[PDB]
Symmetry: C3
Subunit: 334 residues, 3 copies
Amino acid sequence: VDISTLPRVKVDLVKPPFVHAHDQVAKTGPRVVEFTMTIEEKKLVIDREGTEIHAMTFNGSVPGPLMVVHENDYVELRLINPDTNTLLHNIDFHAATGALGGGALTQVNPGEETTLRFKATKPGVFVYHCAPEGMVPWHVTSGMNGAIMVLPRDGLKDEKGQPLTYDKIYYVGEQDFYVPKDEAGNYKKYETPGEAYEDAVKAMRTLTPTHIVFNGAVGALTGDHALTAAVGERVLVVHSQANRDTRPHLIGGHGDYVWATGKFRNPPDLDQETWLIPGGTAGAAFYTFRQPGVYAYVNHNLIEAFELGAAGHFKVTGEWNDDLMTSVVKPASM
Amino acid sequence: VDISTLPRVKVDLVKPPFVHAHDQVAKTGPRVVEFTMTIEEKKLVIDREGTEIHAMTFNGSVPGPLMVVHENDYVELRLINPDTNTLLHNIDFHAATGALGGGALTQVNPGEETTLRFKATKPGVFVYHCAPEGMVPWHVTSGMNGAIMVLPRDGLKDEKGQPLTYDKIYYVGEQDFYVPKDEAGNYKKYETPGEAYEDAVKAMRTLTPTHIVFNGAVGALTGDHALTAAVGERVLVVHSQANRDTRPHLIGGHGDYVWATGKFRNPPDLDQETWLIPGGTAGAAFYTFRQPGVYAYVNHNLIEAFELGAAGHFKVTGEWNDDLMTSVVKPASM
Amino acid sequence: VDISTLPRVKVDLVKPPFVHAHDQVAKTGPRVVEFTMTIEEKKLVIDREGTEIHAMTFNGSVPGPLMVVHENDYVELRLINPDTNTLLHNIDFHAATGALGGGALTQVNPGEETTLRFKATKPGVFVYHCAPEGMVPWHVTSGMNGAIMVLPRDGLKDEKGQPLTYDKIYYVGEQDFYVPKDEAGNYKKYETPGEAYEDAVKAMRTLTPTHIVFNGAVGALTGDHALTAAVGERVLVVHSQANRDTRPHLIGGHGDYVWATGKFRNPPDLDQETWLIPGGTAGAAFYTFRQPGVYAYVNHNLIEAFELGAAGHFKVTGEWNDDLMTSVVKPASM
Ligand SMILES: [Cu+2]
Ligand SMILES: [Cu+2]
Ligand SMILES: [Cu+2]
Ligand SMILES: [Cu+2]
Ligand SMILES: [Cu+2]
Ligand SMILES: [Cu+2]
């Protein structure tokens, strides 16, 4: 059909791990969904030690925000590169078909903008990331990636084809950083993004991240920023990793229904303890909480989680179920 | 129902790779299954060179023993930390719901014990491991992990929903160790577990294991301890990795039915050469032997297998099938 | 039945990424398919810098050629080790049952040959590789691996059991190399394969490839050797990795139907952005091109792709579809 005849809806994006307001089941016919993202290069402190990198962001955050549309909507993205930035950027949507995901059509120097439209023909959660020719892993591993969820028009379904409706959704972007080191192993600092390049490449080529974080920093999803839920609530956790494999796990829970590689035409895997999200992929896990208290949500390479940063928390409110679990004899000396 | 009205059965655990006696199809209604594990910190020699680490074990073995119950049984574990040990330990069951898998309820100092009960609500093979707050990867990568199998009450089923019955079951626990090195690359020794900590963390943070072994040591599942079978026997191999991805493969065989991420409500993948078990997961492969002789069972990163230790053997007895394979012309010079 | 009564067909293999002529749906009954491979040890230049390794090849190429048969055909391979070579070699087919995949029956010194027959009882794409006892990862990571496709006799099927017919097929073999370094980090050279051994083992034991390439070298599948297709063509890309995990991704496309672990009795995963092929496995992705232009086909660890070599291109001819994607506002300063 003629795209100009479709409804347009403008979305203002929100900061991860929260997600902009949407409807699981499409209440309108196909639409052009308009999004705007402003690229921001900024200093970010990524650990408790104060280590500070030059981050390359969509909309100021690592990860970039979660976009949400329905299958066969059109995504229309205005991408702005303000003149306060120093580098060339673009955007590649794994949800899109053609022109390197959009990257070939969206190359913006500082002081430029562009508008891309694509049809979201396949349902699922998908990575998007910057990918400037010759510079691709540097931008992605500087934080310049996020995700897009393309919901089926009739919402999510279980392995039997019956509805799965979430009460809450969170987006966990997992970021591998490669902070270059001096000779004894200390992390380095730079005034601008551009004198860092060869040593960034050298650091990346070790294939050994120095930091692996959720929402841009060690401990970002803890304390006053812990994820929350109530006993009995159905929660969808979308998880992306644009460059490197991860293996999410909810400590004390499960993934009741998981699309590990993120594509909703496939039946979900049931009852997962842990699931492999390959680098370059978004996945999604659905869980109904059954117990209150603190949960850790981790990459279950536990070194990556508890030493390098890939760990967050849920604080869950509600009633304790002694049938599911109980201390029979509390720790004591006999 | 009232748990006190259920039958109780006590199980004495056996050493991996063997598995305690059980029934595939449940011959009773739901039960409380009582298990006892005694934590043992001990020196273990892990390679042919004589490299010796301070291992942290459940029941004296790396991995800890395989527990077997049925879906909707209750697992009641008495966990004992004798005063001959030096560290704080606990236990986290990926099969369980709530309180960090049990870890929040089972913190035992040396000289203490505790009893935990949980309902095994989801069928599958699952990791369990120690997880003391602040110290988690150190304990797991010191060997303090095992697995639990929660069988469906009506046993295993194929991709069509028909019964799959095994004749033999083995449990292969795969362990990544991170032995710290001096400056030239030699492995270090320690008198106690506790002066090793910072260098253990430094060694872990390389994300490069020094050793990756089955059943606690290089070559443990070979020679007089090779796994065995007969042509025509149906064998289930449960394989866990509590911290790091693996990719099991039976050299000269297949996984006829594989639950790579271990959860029996999902149909198995058929005819696998190799399967990815993500770190933090147990998986299970079912194979009917069709040829006699030696098989290697490996992590098919062949460096991890043949250089770092992740390789064992089967010795299979029976008749050779020349229809399946034959040497037409034996190696010779013409 | 009596094998001597079956038809025999001789196949002359072709160089990857091309595939020898075959039929998707079997036009004959089961056959003995005769293949001949000549081992060649040779110097190969693997990067733009001129780094040169002693490669160990089947039929002169890295990867070795793709063999194609149908389920329940017999593969009869004449393996020749000319006296111009220096090492012992053999072959292990993950498609085969017994004798370590054939490796136990095919050990050929220089100046020897052998003929192996096996029944291809399981449909799928499978790795084959050399595996001489005591030396296995050295040979595999020197390039001595390829793949075999065992088609169902009635061809490929979708998730609903309907036919999937490809117009073109390519075989992408992905190779992790571990070039040893001097003390500052320079790559080394050797006159013969055999003085390299301990340092090859040391380099492998880092688990950090120095190079990860498609078709044997950085940029091999680009320029005049880019893969090609037309808009509307159905393409099967078979991808193997004999030693190490990979995560293929078609930049600007998808895997419409993917057998990530390569076994055709399983329904394919639909609409994949990226898929995990575990080390020791072959996988296959089916895609119908919908847009023209350049695509990159990568391992989506983008460091592995764009820094270490795991990237190739498609050049696709045809009409552009502005409904699927369009630049609304080309990059400009306002
Ligand atoms: Cu960028
Ligand atoms: Cu990408
Ligand atoms: Cu412990
Ligand atoms: Cu865990
Ligand atoms: Cu060889
Ligand atoms: Cu193999």
